[PDB]
């Protein structure tokens, strides 16, 4: 009954989409007996955990649990756990098959510097017999001394290609249809995070489903993951640019409250819809991006929804005097 997000989790390396350059190099490394310490870093839902889990299976098969040691932010990994459990496993031979051991530290960037430092010293002293794989969303949250100890493989956001492919898979083993530019919308809104795609896709396989053969539209998606639509958004801009303040101040005030949108969303979409116009003076661009960027920033700290909105109208308007 696993929510799709988990349901469609790569069982093997051949099931990971859009990280080929990583899969190939890694596999070559193992087949050539030159597997270095690994650092898999990237944004959410890119296949990082799926990948080492699969890589580990493929390498040890069933001797997995007795040849691999995995810890994650849910586990306790302070300095004590490092010099002890981790260090022990790294300095002790295997009980079953012969070879090198593998320690997986997931969401390693959740570890403290003290622990990271100790971790690193362990990895240094037992590099000639055990292999480490560190995973993280941000390398920068990792101690340079730790990072400098392994070969890096950045997991980039899933490309259209990859995500389009997985969408195809889920649509088969699930009585589901997705209109043409609706799949496109799902993509543009997942920002390369395979996780958000599988999530909305089941927030429909339990919404529109009546004849078990309905068609998911652009709408069903835009509304599902509460995000603006070109028409709406691209309209709010016009009201701001042409119509008076009172009128535009209304258009915005309605479009967002009638669709559950938030300035944050609108702004972004506008910045892009506006990024294609052929403005007159260059300053128009500047001041525009500036103020808009300032607005977006103040919001992330919660200021005054009302004012910040009028601020957006003002900024967009003011800047368009060229």
């Amino acid at each position: 009954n696993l929510p799709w997000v988990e349901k469609y989790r790569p069982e093997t390396l051949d099931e990971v989409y859009g990280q080929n350059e990583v899969i190939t190099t890694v596999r070559k490394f193992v087949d050539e007996g030159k597997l270095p310490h690994l650092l898999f870093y990237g944004p959410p839902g890119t296949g990082k955990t799926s990948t080492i889990v699969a890589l580990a299976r493929e390498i040890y098969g069933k001797n997995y649990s007795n040849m691999v040691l995995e810890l994650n932010a849910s586990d306790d990994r302070g300095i004590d756990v490092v010099r002890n459990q981790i260090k022990d496993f790294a300095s002790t031979r295997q009980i079953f098959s012969k070879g090198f051991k593998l320690i997986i530290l997931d969401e390693a960037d959740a570890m403290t510097n003290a622990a990271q430092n100790a971790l690193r010293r362990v990895i240094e002293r037992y590099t000639k017999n055990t292999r480490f794989c560190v995973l993280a969303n941000y390398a920068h949250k990792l101690t340079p001394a730790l990072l400098s100890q392994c070969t890096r493989f950045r997991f980039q956001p899933l490309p259209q290609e990859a995500i389009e492919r997985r969408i195809a898979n889920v649509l088969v083993h699930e009585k589901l249809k997705l209109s043409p530019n609706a799949e496109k919308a799902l993509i543009e809104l997942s920002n390369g995070d395979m996780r958000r795609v599988l999530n909305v896709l089941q927030s429909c396989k339990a919404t529109l489903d009546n004849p078990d053969e309905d068609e998911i539209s652009d709408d069903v998606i835009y509304e599902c993951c509460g995000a603006p639509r070109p028409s709406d958004l691209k309209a709010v801009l016009k009201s701001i640019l042409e119509d008076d303040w009172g009128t535009a101040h209304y258009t915005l005030n309605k479009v967002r409250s009638a669709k559950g949108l938030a300035l944050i969303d609108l702004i972004e979409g506008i910045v892009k819809i506006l990024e294609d116009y052929e403005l007159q003076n260059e300053e128009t661009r500047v001041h525009l991006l500036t103020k808009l960027a300032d607005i977006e920033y103040s919001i992330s700290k919660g200021g005054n929804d009302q004012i910040q909105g009028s601020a957006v109208i003002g900024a967009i308007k003011a800047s368009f005097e060229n």
Partner: peptide, 28 residues
């Protein structure tokens, strides 16, 4: 002061604009 100026019909747009930015600044 916000709700006022932005609704009032006696203030020019150029005024609306600048006042908007000011309330935002001070607010932040």
């Amino acid at each position: 002061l916000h709700e006022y100026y932005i609704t009032n019909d006696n203030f020019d747009t150029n005024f609306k604009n600048q006042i908007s930015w000011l309330l935002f600044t001070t607010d932040s």
